[PDB]
């Protein structure tokens, strides 16, 4: 019943700028409901979220779980291991899913699964490894039949046979080093001479733009096996957050960073005011860190460190103001007393 | 009377496309199985080995095969298997699954069919902890494939000398092995013959020349491959076949999306020109027919996102330009 | 510490230590502090063969 | 001795040997003495491009 526009609006409240990824998830979730409403067999298209650090992959999933009537779980690929080893088994994901559905098998098969840090199980090289990849390739192999569809045994609290042909899988990870792979395939003009195309570090293809030209052969060289990529046919890319986006992240979202510190200072008894000029400076410094939106927390804290250290001892403090200079370190935040 | 191989192939053709060689092999083996069942000299069973690239139709053949045959059919994944005594799974578990389909009828289960997918995932590595999921599983299967009594809880003893086994997997890297052995050259002079990448034989053309020694280098035990004398090879895919997968099969993508839009109140139409373009793109992805699903999704993403909001929409048409992204799909209102 | 499915202690073991000090009170352990010393010892040094997996 | 996660050995094994002499009395072992011989063998070669398990 819910339309993708409605779903994207819920995500837009918490996620800024990932229009393409919000469309894919909205459409997939809507199609999941459509496919769910009907009991010709309708196949499912699994998603693959590729984006840089601090782009909103895990955030999109968390925002999705809030509005998802069907069971949603969010697993991790690091803990997984090939069957027969001490590490957590791949089937545990299904067990985790049942916990959300009160151990209802019919309600679990209709679920959505998010797998984060999928890039951590990738093979080291394109060619098969000569040693057993317990936490890498082995996990990919075991996931194949899970995504496409098979029956899995789950210990209830005998085993419970849970099918996965209808379960949706959203495997997302920050593929680091994939941009280099794409550049080799897309540039093909490296060299030293005149005919060669020599460009500077600046004014060249960025990581965000390169991922937009991602194709399976690129992921193959990164380590993902061909069988695994076929299970995940829908590839959604998230671009690097621009300064304009970061400025919005600080105030527009409901659980924004500025609101977090305001709540902290408010329960303490102090008001916190961020001037518009300051938010533009924080974004500039953050981009330099190349850590995404998370970089904002590093700037803000360093700017209010001394303030937070001296404020509780201080008395009769009702408001704090942070102008652009405070970020640069050439000034001290202004304080207003009662 | 019992069905003839021609009839079996017709049933498979309804859901499978472009695997004439393997379809014959499976139909022949299945027909022979019924002949042995009626004749309950002792006839021997030929185990099958399905080798094909991703999205070629191996698992599909097995699923379609199960639908028409009466005898018990069980689908197993070699990944979950482990050496006896470990916590992953036991090889005899396969038989247990079989009995569920046979309702714990041994006489009806010994005459059954078994399929083992992802067989290439239990290969042998080059390290000296014990590879519980590799060589150990192969040795345990040898006993199962050759024929022996296995204890299964309802324990029950179930012979396996008569059970048929169809082990198939997408052997990746096997093409490289064959190329070394078969594609000699790489000189530097005038007389020498350079690679000439365009000329390079693709996996489909390269796997047809497979021999048992090739599988040895891939990591399979010799006794294992010997037990499986038959080797059915699948071509990667053909662009003509890709265009057929979208229209001829029962559960084709076009029919899926048409049903999707239909329950929503919209009739989706695909033009022949578009299907040719989608097939071309799919072949470039080198992920089989499954990659084809992505292209369709992308071309329809914007549409499916804005379709419910739209009102008085009775039909959607996808042109060749829509696939490339230059144009927007046309709509017809009511 | 080591990657999952290896001989070394698992990362989750840290939380176990926390529970021991918290008398296995999960509600009191989710509010704890953790200090991971020698964090420089888990860094890929540079320019090494990628055939092997840096599990440490 | 080798790095954690490798086939050779773990450094905690030393304490186990110490406990053997202490009859598995932790309080008696926590105040023990250890002699690590051949310490020169655990040495580099400056930084190292690859991991030195031993």
């Amino acid at each position: 019943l819910p339309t993708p526009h409605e779903i994207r609006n819920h995500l837009d409240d918490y996620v800024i700028g990932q229009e393409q990824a919000k469309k894919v998830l909205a459409v997939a979730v809507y199609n999941h409901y459509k496919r769910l409403r009907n009991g010709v067999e309708l196949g499912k298209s699994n998603i693959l979220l590729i984006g840089p650090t601090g782009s909103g992959k895990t955030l999109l999933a968390e925002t999705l779980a809030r509005l998802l009537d069907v069971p949603f779980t969010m697993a991790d690929a690091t803990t997984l291991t090939e069957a027969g080893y001490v590490g957590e088994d791949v089937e545990n994901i299904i067990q985790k899913l049942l916990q959300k559905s009160d151990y209802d098998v019919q309600k679990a098969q209709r679920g959505i699964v998010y797998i984060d840090e999928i890039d951590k199980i990738s093979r080291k090289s394109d060619n098969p490894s000569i040693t057993r990849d317990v936490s890498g390739e082995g996990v990919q192999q075991a996931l194949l039949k899970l995504i496409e569809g098979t029956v899995a045994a789950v210990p209830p609290q005998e085993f419970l046979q849970v099918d996965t042909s209808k379960i949706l899988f959203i495997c997302g990870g920050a593929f680091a080093g994939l941009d280099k792979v794409i550049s080799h395939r897309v540039e093909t003009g490296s060299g030293i001479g005149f005919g060669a195309t020599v460009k500077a570090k600046s004014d060249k293809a960025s990581e965000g733009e390169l991922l937009a030209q991602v194709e399976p052969e690129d992921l193959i060289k990164f380590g993902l096996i061909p069988e695994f990529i076929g299970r995940l046919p829908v590839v959604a890319t998230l671009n690097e957050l621009s300064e304009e986006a970061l400025i919005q992240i600080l105030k527009e979202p409901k659980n924004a960073l500025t609101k977090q510190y305001q709540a902290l200072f408010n329960l303490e008894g102090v008001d916190l005011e961020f001037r518009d000029e300051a938010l533009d400076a924080i974004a500039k410094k953050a981009m330099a860190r190349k850590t995404g939106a998370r970089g904002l927390r590093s700037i803000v804290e360093a700017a209010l460190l001394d303030t937070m250290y001296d404020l509780p001892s201080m008395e009769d403090v009702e408001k704090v103001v942070i102008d652009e200079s405070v970020i640069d370190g050439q000034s001290e935040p202004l304080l207003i007393y009662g | 009377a019992l069905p003839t191989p021609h009839e079996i192939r017709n049933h498979l053709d309804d859901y499978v496309i472009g695997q004439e060689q393997a379809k014959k092999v499976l139909a022949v083996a299945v027909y022979n199985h019924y002949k042995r069942l009626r004749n309950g000299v002792e006839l021997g069973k030929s185990n099958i080995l399905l080798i094909g690239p991703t999205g070629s139709g191996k698992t599909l053949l097995a699923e379609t095969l199960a639908r028409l045959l009466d005898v018990p059919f069980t689908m197993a994944d070699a990944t979950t298997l482990t050496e006896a005594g470990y916590v992953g799974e036991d090889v005899e578990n396969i038989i247990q699954k079989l009995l569920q389909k046979s309702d714990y009828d041994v006489q009806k289960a010994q005459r059954g069919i078994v399929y083992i997918d992802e067989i290439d995932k239990i290969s042998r590595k080059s390290d000296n902890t014990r590879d519980v999921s590799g060589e150990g599983v192969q040795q345990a299967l040898l006993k199962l494939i050759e024929g022996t009594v296995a204890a299964v809880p309802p324990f029950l003893q179930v012979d396996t000398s008569k059970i048929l086994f169809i082990c198939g997997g997408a052997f990746a890297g096997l093409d490289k092995v064959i190329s070394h052995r078969v594609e000699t050259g790489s000189g530097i002079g005038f007389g020498a013959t350079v690679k000439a990448k365009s000329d390079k034989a693709s996996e489909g053309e390269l796997l047809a020349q497979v021999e048992p020694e090739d599988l040895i280098k891939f990591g399979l035990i010799p006794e294992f491959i010997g037990r499986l004398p038959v080797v059915a090879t699948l071509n990667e895919l053909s662009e003509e076949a890709l265009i057929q997968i979208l229209k001829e099969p029962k559960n084709a993508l076009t029919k899926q999306y048409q049903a999707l839009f239909n329950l929503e109140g919209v009739d989706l139409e695909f033009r022949d020109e578009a299907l040719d373009a989608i097939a071309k793109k799919a072949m470039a992805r080198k992920t089989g027919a499954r990659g084809l699903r992505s292209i369709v999704e992308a071309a329809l993403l914007d549409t499916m996102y804005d379709l419910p909001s739209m009102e008085d929409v009775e039909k959607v048409v996808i042109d060749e330009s829509v696939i490339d992204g230059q144009s927007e799909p046309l709509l017809i209102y009511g | 510490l080591t990657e999952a499915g290896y001989v070394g202690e698992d990362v989750e073991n840290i939380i176990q230590k926390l529970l021991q000090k918290s008398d296995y009170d999960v509600q009191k352990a989710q509010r704890g502090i953790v200090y991971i010393d020698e964090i420089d010892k888990i860094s890929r040094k540079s320019d090494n063969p990628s055939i092997t997996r840096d599990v440490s | 001795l080798t790095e954690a996660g490798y086939v050779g050995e773990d450094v905690e094994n030393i304490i186990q040997k110490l406990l053997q002499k202490s009859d598995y009395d932790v309080q008696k072992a926590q105040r023990g003495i250890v002699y690590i011989d051949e310490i020169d063998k655990i040495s580099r070669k400056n930084p190292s491009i690859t991991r030195d398990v031993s």
């Binding site: 027969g84 080893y85 001490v86 057993r132 317990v134 | 482990t82 005594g85 470990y86 916590v87 992953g88 390290d127 902890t129 014990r130 519980v132 | 499915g5 290896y6 001989v7 092997t52 997996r53 599990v55 | 996660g5 490798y6 086939v7 398990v53």
Partner: peptide, 10 residues
């Protein structure tokens, strides 16, 4: 059964 822990070499 008994879980196996792979010990990396070299």
């Amino acid at each position: 059964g008994g879980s196996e822990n792979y010990a990396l070499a070299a």
